[PDB]
Amino acid sequence: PAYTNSFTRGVYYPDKVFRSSVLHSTQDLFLPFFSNVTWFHADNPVLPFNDGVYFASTEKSNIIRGWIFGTTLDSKTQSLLIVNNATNVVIKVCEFQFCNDPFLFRVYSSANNCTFEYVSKNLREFVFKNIDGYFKIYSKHTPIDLPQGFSALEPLVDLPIGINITRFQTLLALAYYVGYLQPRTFLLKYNENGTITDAVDCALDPLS
Amino acid sequence: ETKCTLKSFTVEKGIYQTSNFRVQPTESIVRFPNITNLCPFGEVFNATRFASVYAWNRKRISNCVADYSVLYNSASFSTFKCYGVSPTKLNDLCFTNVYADSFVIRGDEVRQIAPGQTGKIADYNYKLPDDFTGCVIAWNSNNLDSKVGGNYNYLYRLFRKSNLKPFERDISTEIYQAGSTPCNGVEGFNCYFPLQSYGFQPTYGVGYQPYRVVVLSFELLHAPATVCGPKKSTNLVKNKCVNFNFNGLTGTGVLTESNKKFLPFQQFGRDIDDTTDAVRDPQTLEILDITPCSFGGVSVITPGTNTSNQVAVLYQGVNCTEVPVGSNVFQTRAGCLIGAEHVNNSYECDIPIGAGICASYQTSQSIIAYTMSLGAENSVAYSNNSIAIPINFTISVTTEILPVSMTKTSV
Amino acid sequence: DCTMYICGDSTECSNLLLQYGSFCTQLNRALTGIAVEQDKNTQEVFAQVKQIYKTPPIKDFGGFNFSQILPDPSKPSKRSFIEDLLFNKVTLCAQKFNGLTVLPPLLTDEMIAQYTSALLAGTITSGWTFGAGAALQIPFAMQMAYRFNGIGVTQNVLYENQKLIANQFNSAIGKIQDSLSSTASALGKLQDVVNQNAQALNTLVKQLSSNFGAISSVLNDILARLDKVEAEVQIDRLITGRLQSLQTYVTQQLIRAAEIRASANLAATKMSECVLGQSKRVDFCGKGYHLMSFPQSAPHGVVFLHVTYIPAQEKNFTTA
Amino acid sequence: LARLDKVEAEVQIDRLITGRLQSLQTYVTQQLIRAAEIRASANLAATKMSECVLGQSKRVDFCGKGYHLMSFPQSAPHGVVFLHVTYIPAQEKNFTTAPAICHDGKAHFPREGVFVSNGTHWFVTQRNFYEPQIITTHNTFVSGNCD
Amino acid sequence: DCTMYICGDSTECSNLLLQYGSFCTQLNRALTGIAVEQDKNTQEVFAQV
């Protein structure tokens, strides 16, 4: 796989609390500034999840459609399936017997013991967290390698599911970047409209 | 009030802060989500077969309205401890989500189901966190979980390599090794199966009898609420000073319509100094500013009691539309001034009030309030060729008094 | 408001606070002494003039031009030009749940500007005599000639070079005007006092977010969630921590007040010795031999424009 | 101590100790601050003793209003009182004035004092007391011409 | 060093100290003002020339 500099990408709203015209120091799992993120081209290999994942895609044909998360990634344990079908975003938790090479429907051979379900030029950014019995998704779509700049990902949805995740894989329909979150203190700047316009990764360097 | 706060029957001329004004709330508002779905406690308390404590079951309770009085008012529970929450107030409070955990244990083991506990159950079966927010409910089940010849349905972990983390579960059956002798997957010396089954014969003593346990864990978070008590939501009113309770967010304030552009996921808004400053109504979804009900020091302006018993009151920083009120009213920049009479004359500052305003007892005497004079105006009559020279002189003696020491004291 | 900072709206907390007795009376009393002293400090510096002296309409001051320092009638506050610059250059009712309130000063900025105008008007129209009491008028060029005698220069040096001296003075005032417009750090001595007080209040307010060991820093949470016997144990932690936090603020404000008190006594001394007189004290009223000083008001401070004679173009001579 | 045994009494006493200790610390802290205020006032009083009583001070308003003549110290409880004696100009009168006198083309300036006209005759006088004297070659000095 | 005087090498103590909030920032800031002022005091006396 290739590699690229993440620059100031990957900031998200840490809490569902409106704040404006204020600088707030928050401590949470954030993608470190200028982090060395992995780069792939459409590639659907299985990747570790660690403490959390930053995922972004540069696209013009909507080829990337979903993700699968778990540990064994087979029917021996529950696993989370996220899939953006042609009409709805769909989310399911089940003991999916995932295929050796999932694609779009040929994602799994069989499924059982399901316990959660939910149904709803372009740079698409996503952040996935799995903390304290919640799976949390943040995202933003930006009109446009990973471009240098700053914008904050808003919470898309969260799942009150207690599942265990250690690795994940991407689902494609017949280029993207992956980064890992780390516990970092970020000083966030909120404008008068209450949107984050700048941030300082306090551990980056002495000036920060 | 001055005499009382000075603890003196006589008062010298001056301005004395005696107390603090506060606009008391007109009425109390309660606003919970309009959810009618009753929380399904029945299926966790009245399940036929409970889980083995080594494999303790968990169920999420959410998007429902609870009534914990149904539980706490029942006499059948032998133990109903709560941590970080009180069993009575539990019905007035509201939560984001709740986890109900259940298992069967010996009566002697109920004491281990508490935060900070240790022992076989606490260390290797069900560990509570140090800052546990829930309630532990337990009752004797020797009428259901025991039988003649003993019931061996239930199991507990007797051996483990390390202590469990809070709310961790381990259903592994690998034979434990207690010494240097390898076990190779079979029991023997220093090699023991990690699970054991209780001797639930019905004739056993209470400490050995089976007990059913349900543990409720409450997720108090900034996230939106989904499990509120049975409180009926009141009507919503604005601009009045009122008490409020939004999904548990309790306080007093002047609810005002907000132009703050909350994003659709946001539920609360905060001050520069992180105090709660705005809130989303859980039914209308409108955004409300929470301005504090106004307050201010109450200063009493008085000549000496040896001069007069008449006094004026300054409500510092308070606006005269807010005070409840001997009936002269004057909005100084220092605050609403009451009982003092405004005049257009100017005099030397007798009693200082602030922002250039002073007060004095003057004529029919009354406490007047006026803009202070800085001194007499005087044009010096300067010209490019005129000088003034004193024809005479005054020898003046001026007393200056200076503190030099203070009373030497020791404790 | 000690009881509101510590307990807010809670009567349950207010009753617990009574167990600590006099501490809230002491804190309010200490802050009141500091506040009352701020008016004393201002009165001691500016209220030195007995009468509000007014300048003549015809400013025939021997060629010396005080237009930048005398009042501008067009300004709503009737401040001078330099005073308006000073007020513009310093850059920073109660609606706060934490009980914090800012009291207004006794003398408004307009009154302080009126005192500095009286001090300045008296100085140029009567010299040092308004300090002694009589405010004897004297032509400005002649009182400047006495200032020369005071520094040990013969008075003929003033009259023979009056045009040059006036041109030098007018140019120096212009340099001040340009300097205060262009510079930033010059008023840092006043800005530091604002920054110290602001930072001390932000510290006091942020301490309300701390738990001090309680289950929550928000006192309404504890009362909404725990019964009296358990709530009082948790509230006593917040009370103890908040009380200590407020004591730390009041203690350091008493120390800062003593620093300002010393600076106010100094400013009052310079008003008397540099403005109402001519001072023989070396470096008390600027560098060089002191001629006269003009006071200008600033936000929570005073600016002295010290005018001094500085020897130049020294030449070697044999002496005996 | 009369009502609780050692293990329980010590828990209750530790509260009194903590509160009383904090109460006493608050007193000592504020006394240190007050002592510094008195110290400054004592240094000032000591300065006025030296400069106003043991001498004559040219410092304006240091030793009362007006021109300082002398001061007399008087003791007071925990303090000192200075009776400052000063000269205050009175009954000021307007006079026409000139910076120099032109004579035979020479410009004359006062050695000490100021030139004043009673309306018709020019005199020289001291600045702080009207005592007019004839303008003479002795009480004035020459410098340059009249232009 | 306020956190080292109070807690030394202990991370367990350091996390408890956070519950007291700003006190260690205030103490370090106060001592820094005193230290910076000592250089001002020396400059004011001797750097007059």
Ligand SMILES: *[C@@H]1O[C@H](CO[C@@H]2O[C@@H](C)[C@@H](O)[C@@H](O)[C@@H]2O)[C@@H](O[C@@H]2O[C@H](CO)[C@@H](O)[C@H](O)[C@H]2NC(C)=O)[C@H](O)[C@H]1NC(C)=O
């Ligand atoms: C000094 O005189 C002025 C007035 O000048 C007058 O005309 C001169 C040519 C000369 O003859 C002076 O002696 C005359 O007195 C006085 O100023 C006026 O005072 C009155 C009150 O007494 C006041 O109403 C006027 O407005 C003043 N005029 C100005 C221009 O201010 C001044 O009081 C005299 N001073 C003394 C000490 O006698």
Ligand SMILES: *[C@@H]1O[C@H](CO)[C@@H](O[C@@H]2O[C@H](CO)[C@@H](O)[C@H](O)[C@H]2NC(C)=O)[C@H](O)[C@H]1NC(C)=O
């Ligand atoms: C999630 O499940 C994985 C297993 O799929 C757990 O990983 C094991 O953790 C133990 C320590 O607890 C190690 O000894 C094993 O080697 C791990 N196995 C693998 C395959 O990595 C993991 O601990 C679980 N996480 C949680 C939070 O329960």
Ligand SMILES: *[C@@H]1O[C@H](CO)[C@@H](O[C@@H]2O[C@H](CO)[C@@H](O)[C@H](O)[C@H]2NC(C)=O)[C@H](O)[C@H]1NC(C)=O
């Ligand atoms: C995308 O997935 C959704 C389910 O999440 C599908 O929606 C269902 O469609 C069938 C008809 O095919 C309906 O009977 C169901 O009621 C629908 N369910 C919901 C929740 O809407 C949808 O058809 C899928 N789209 C595609 C193109 O496959």
Ligand SMILES: *[C@@H]1O[C@H](CO)[C@@H](O[C@@H]2O[C@H](CO)[C@@H](O)[C@H](O)[C@H]2NC(C)=O)[C@H](O)[C@H]1NC(C)=O
């Ligand atoms: C779904 O999960 C349950 C466990 O929760 C599985 O039930 C176990 O099945 C095995 C046989 O495969 C039995 O030996 C266990 O006794 C069962 N446990 C319980 C609690 O019933 C079940 O097999 C799973 N189903 C599928 C299709 O995977």
Ligand SMILES: *[C@@H]1O[C@H](CO)[C@@H](O[C@@H]2O[C@H](CO)[C@@H](O)[C@H](O)[C@H]2NC(C)=O)[C@H](O)[C@H]1NC(C)=O
């Ligand atoms: C005190 O509060 C009242 C409101 O209760 C203020 O009155 C308003 O003043 C504005 C002008 O500033 C008017 O347009 C409104 O119509 C007034 N409202 C009412 C109900 O009279 C008043 O200005 C405040 N006073 C001060 C000094 O702030």
Ligand SMILES: *[C@@H]1O[C@H](CO)[C@@H](O[C@@H]2O[C@H](CO)[C@@H](O)[C@H](O)[C@H]2NC(C)=O)[C@H](O)[C@H]1NC(C)=O
């Ligand atoms: C100088 O001032 C004194 C007052 O301090 C004047 O003395 C008074 O003079 C009148 C007569 O004009 C007497 O009736 C008073 O009894 C005197 N008082 C005192 C205390 O002696 C004195 O006249 C003034 N001198 C001039 C030249 O004006």
Ligand SMILES: *[C@@H]1O[C@H](CO)[C@@H](O[C@@H]2O[C@H](CO)[C@@H](O)[C@H](O)[C@H]2NC(C)=O)[C@H](O)[C@H]1NC(C)=O
């Ligand atoms: C006194 O000083 C002011 C400047 O502070 C002079 O005012 C300027 O005068 C010129 C004309 O000579 C104008 O072009 C400027 O616009 C004026 N500036 C301001 C700020 O008004 C004034 O002329 C000086 N007076 C004398 C007699 O020298």
Ligand SMILES: *[C@@H]1O[C@H](CO)[C@@H](O[C@@H]2O[C@H](CO)[C@@H](O)[C@H](O)[C@H]2NC(C)=O)[C@H](O)[C@H]1NC(C)=O
């Ligand atoms: C101005 O001063 C002269 C003195 O230099 C005064 O002249 C004297 O006036 C008196 C009468 O008042 C005569 O007896 C003297 O002979 C005059 N002396 C001379 C030398 O002429 C004059 O009166 C004064 N004028 C005013 C208005 O005070």
Ligand SMILES: *[C@@H]1O[C@H](CO)[C@@H](O)[C@H](O)[C@H]1NC(C)=O
């Ligand atoms: C990014 O990390 C990889 C190792 O994972 C390394 O080989 C590569 O050189 C790094 N690139 C940069 C730009 O640091």
Ligand SMILES: *[C@@H]1O[C@H](CO)[C@@H](O)[C@H](O)[C@H]1NC(C)=O
């Ligand atoms: C369990 O069933 C009994 C009736 O048999 C009922 O009274 C009780 O409320 C049920 N439990 C709960 C938690 O509702």
Ligand SMILES: *[C@@H]1O[C@H](CO)[C@@H](O)[C@H](O)[C@H]1NC(C)=O
């Ligand atoms: C709750 O009440 C509001 C009206 O105040 C209504 O619009 C809303 O639909 C109700 N909630 C639900 C889930 O229907």
Ligand SMILES: *[C@@H]1O[C@H](CO)[C@@H](O)[C@H](O)[C@H]1NC(C)=O
């Ligand atoms: C009260 O005032 C009278 C004069 O009206 C005076 O004689 C008396 O001494 C005063 N008493 C006190 C205690 O001030």
Ligand SMILES: *[C@@H]1O[C@H](CO)[C@@H](O)[C@H](O)[C@H]1NC(C)=O
């Ligand atoms: C006092 O002055 C104001 C103008 O500032 C005027 O409106 C008011 O009528 C005056 N009142 C009296 C009693 O003279």
Ligand SMILES: [Zn+2]
């Ligand atoms: Zn001689």
